[model samples]
Target: SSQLHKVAQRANRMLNVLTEQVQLQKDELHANEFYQVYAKAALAKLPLLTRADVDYAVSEMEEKGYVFDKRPAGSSMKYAMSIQNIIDIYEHRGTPKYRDRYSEAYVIFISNLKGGVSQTTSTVSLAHAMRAHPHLLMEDLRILVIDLDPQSSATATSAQAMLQNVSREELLEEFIVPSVVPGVDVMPASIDDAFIASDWRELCNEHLPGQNIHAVLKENVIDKLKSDYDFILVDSGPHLDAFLKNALASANILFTPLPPATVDFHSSLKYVARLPELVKLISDEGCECQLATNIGFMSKLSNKADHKYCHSLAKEVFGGDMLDVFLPRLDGFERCGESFDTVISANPATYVGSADALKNARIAAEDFAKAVFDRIEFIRSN
Candidate 1:
């Protein structure tokens, strides 16, 4: 035990040094250069409006101090606007009502029983995509990301909060911290959360003997904040535990990201096979499980024939449950990760990586977001 403690102490020291180095890299990012801006042509493409309409909106935004034009050396004008400002432009043009579309926030859980499948990347990217989606505006879209992984990769990437600095009490009190992406908030996780299951079990046994402990997240957190946001996305740990159970009980949609490798596909099938029993257990606990739909999407895809074959196999197995949109393995994702940014929020022109890669990544992320949004709208209407 003493030797184990010594190893743990050494690991913690290494973690602190690594954390500081990453923080310095993040601090070096210039907001103007890092954040994406839109040219008139690009803005027009989003709303399918003409250049004149975009110009009018830009003119109004400039008058109201909502947008500032930037001109790079020998480049045309680009407008920097927040998600809210973009929504305001639509509203000013008397675009139809888009706010208050949902009575309660919809919860989506990004889960897979396997690890290293891109759950954190998908969660953060989806948050940014939904907020900035052309068909959706800020009035109708507000996102909250809940990071349940003790490693806190989602929290670090989106919220820019160091894992060591976040306390459990702060997470409980504030509920969410503002993210680098506009219109998104994050409930960060800390290393202390590694013991959450044991802590929760002990508390339940001692204080609430007959209560549904798995409903703690839904009852204590999501339920209270439903009215404040349009969607709440939970980024679960890569295993089934108390956190996964809580997320499963609370979710309206379950999105499983499957990498189309043989081992990953096999493990994903196992996860899906075991899900019904888990759901039954949660239901037997007298918790109101609000799960509406389950979706499986492909991620980390490549052009290899083996990958294509696995994708075809996955489609044959999962059928309509699989989405057509897949996230490709791209250098842009890695470059953005190095700076704790997402493809949606990172500007390709000023980025330190391949501009074409970032552009393609942005397109892929938007396609994935649109596919998910289509499903969401269908569920909402029903």
Candidate 2:
């Protein structure tokens, strides 16, 4: 029967994928670790199998007496996934490999005093695109996205439920969530973390008594990531506060996503001037933190004359710090953000604009991937 053929074909595919995954990652996977398995497309095989089907087939597997000791504590979800569950699932294998490698990961903080300029979106897109760059082979670069924004927009955009469901204390304990983008992880943010925005000053006044509170993230977060990843990209709050301070104090490279408009340009100008002062002030207060090297990018641009006019001004301001490419304004950003889909996941064409609008967004994503990924080479070479 036709139905039988479909089932047989799916079974074969599942077996083949599982065999491949286990062989490739057997050394990295722990004997007792499991992940949440989800089927992204219909008829995708095991490892690649739909979570729905995996859940259904799980009951039958249990009936057959297969013991799954690796499922997370107290969760009833049936798919026993491990790190290998999402590894290389969406990774492309043609990007140039990073030649000037460092023994440790490189950290870049994405920040801007002006809000709504695609800071969060860029953080996610750059992470996703780097792993699956259009032309370059995958360099096996491990990336981590740190959501230091109290707004939690980046976390909400990519991993909302995980942020909303856990208690503030419980959430910090969770550390990182594996993102839909293969090989990238997110340190989720929640509204509760917003408490630091208000309480940071008070903490320095009362607890540390003359120590740099900005050192909090550098000591606790950035240093810990040194051994685990190749790159760590942080998303920051738009305001100047403990959240933004923590972001800057922890970075090796500091960059802002600047929009080409009068107000945004002015706001970013203030940030560029002010962030270094804050980084220095914190260091002087016994933090011993290094000032982050600043970088800028012209983002969310359109062909409007005003945008072009401001673009020329930004080049003058940032000069060598500015990226060579610009991310043109597009609807794909909002469309993809609503679903927590990065450009890589926005797929086949989630773009919904002019005849060439989709093409531009794709170009922007690729350019970003190259800019960020190429940092590894530039930083290490020197």
Candidate 3:
């Protein structure tokens, strides 16, 4: 055990080194250079705005201390702005559409019982995509990502915080760490969070005997932040445990990513089949546990014939519960993951992939986000 612990410590140290290197690279890219947005891309993102509107916005921003100088070797006289600058333009000049459309925040649980299903990557990517959504851009949507996975992949991908240095009190008091993406916040987790199960059991046995332990996260954390955010996205570890139960009880929407590999598809079916009983168990423990929607979407798909076959099979099997928009497997996702970033946040120029590949990945991510947003909007309207 001691030897294992030493090995784990070495691995953790190496993880920190990799994380720091990525952070430095991102800082240089985001703060110093690299992430500058050209006129055409910004215009494409804000489709509703005309070129004149964008040119005017850019000029306004430049007057307000933002840099929008023409890049070297670029023939166009149009200046470049950073991603945040583009977001600022949207905030100031964009029309209000979805603001105050919902009275309370919607809690979404991105869950699966199968590991390596791209759960964390999807969660982070969705958060960034929603933040950049055209309709929501005008509303300045605020998202809070609650990273319940002990591996902290979502946390690492979104924010720069070192989990080992964070204390329990710090986590509770200053709960949110602002992420690299504008308008997204993260409640990070680490391996230390693995103790939550035992801690909850002990607390229930000794101090809170009659309380609904499964609703602890809902009562103590989510309820307090509902009014502060537009969406609360929970990224769960690939297991059924106290933490997963808490997330299940708290969520209004459950999104399960099903990869089309044979084993992964079978495992997802098993999880779907058992989901009702799990919800019943939580409800039996006095938690409301009502899900507004349970959605399954195909993820990590390739152009292979076998993958396409399974994709069609999944559509048939899931039927109405399946999403029409699917996320394709892309090398851009892998490159972004290596740097602990997402397709929406990482600059295409710096990412180790063809710009067309990154652009396609971004489009796929945005489509998925729009699909989820459509569901939320439907629910809100009803």
Candidate 4:
């Protein structure tokens, strides 16, 4: 246990090392802002505080004229601190910069109409890769990962450190937490997200009455974080729903992961066929954003004949839109997922199952990053 504790501490230390001296503001802490911070602080020697405890804290702090009014979302019931007030009282001694920054972040949405192609896994892995890409300095790209899937598997795996350090609700910042991978922050999904899936349609039909309702994430979430980070990668849930459409409408880049499985292969064809309809929906709604160009890639493929077959099919359909690389199925992804680590974090200098597999996983992430970079450059150049 003692040795394990040391291992945990060493791994956690990486986050601190990678965290820049960036400033966080009251405005930026919305919904997910104060959730984890207060809970963990209180838990050192005390029981997890209640929602009322948080309510009282904010009330007292506000009454004292500290100005911590940015209580994160769901705080009305779930509970949160007045983060600005807490910072003012405890961390920031005097007036600090209030501006969080203007939203310059590029939003990337990862989706597939089908399942089991490592959509979430790629989402989490690619996030780490971009942040720590071999070609880019850790500071060159700051990443925020939004796990739109209600299951929050990516959150459980990617943000395990934050999850472990901070207890669940009545605890803090489950909504927004720093991932184990440095320079990458994550907004975790909750049951409420599942509710968003179920409730959005009903609410929209009754309230807006046949409105497209595509900009909820953009208006509510992305606008707030754009200025604070360089990239926002959203892991849209497996099924195609208004939620996925919302991400499609919001993103600057569309990243779809299609494994070489025949089911996914057929699904990709259907997805492309359906793109025009989604485009028309956005256009009909007068959305400010257009559907970004698709940058599709084949992932988690192993069989040589299967790889060649899927690659040829994808090329026939996507042409230059498809990435030049076909990511091999690496057991390292499986192993890393077991520990909530990525190839970058889990890749050792030597030893373990299939050293060649580890090597390929590393290459795959770098290749993915390179393709994404090239795609971005192509867009800018055009």
Candidate 1: the clashing residue pairs are none
Error of 4 at 243 (Å): 0.5
Worst 10 residues of 4 by lDDT: 157-166
- Superposed Cα deviation of residue 363, candidate 2 (Å): 32
Tens-digit lDDT track of model 4 for 1-382: 5644655565566445445323344445563442433332342232233345544555565666555323344645332333223343332223222222333888888875553334555677788787444323313456888777655333333122112223333122445677666567777655455665767666666544534567766755666566767888888743637677788778887866664543346667687678768767765775768775888887763578987886775555455566887554543233445556666676465344456666676788789878889988988898
Off by over 4 Å in 2: 1-100, 116-118, 152-173, 203-211, 238-240, 301-382
Report the lDDT of model 1 for residue 130: 84
Tens-digit lDDT track for model 1 on 133-179? 76666354778888776554433321212112234444435557777
lDDT of 2 at 244: 75
TM-score per candidate, in order? 0.61, 0.48, 0.60, 0.45
lDDT by residue for model 2 (309-360), tens: 8776555545455677776544334344555665445554544434354556
Report backbone clashes per prediction. 0, 13, 0, 9
Every candidate's lDDT: 0.67, 0.59, 0.67, 0.58
Output the worst ten-in-a-row residue range by lDDT, candidate 3.
157-166
State the TM-score for model 4: 0.45
How much is 248 displaced in model 3, in angstroms? 1.4
Q: Write the per-residue lDDT of candidate 3 for residues 1-61, one digit (tens) a residue.
A: 5644655665577668778989877865765542235454556556467778776666676
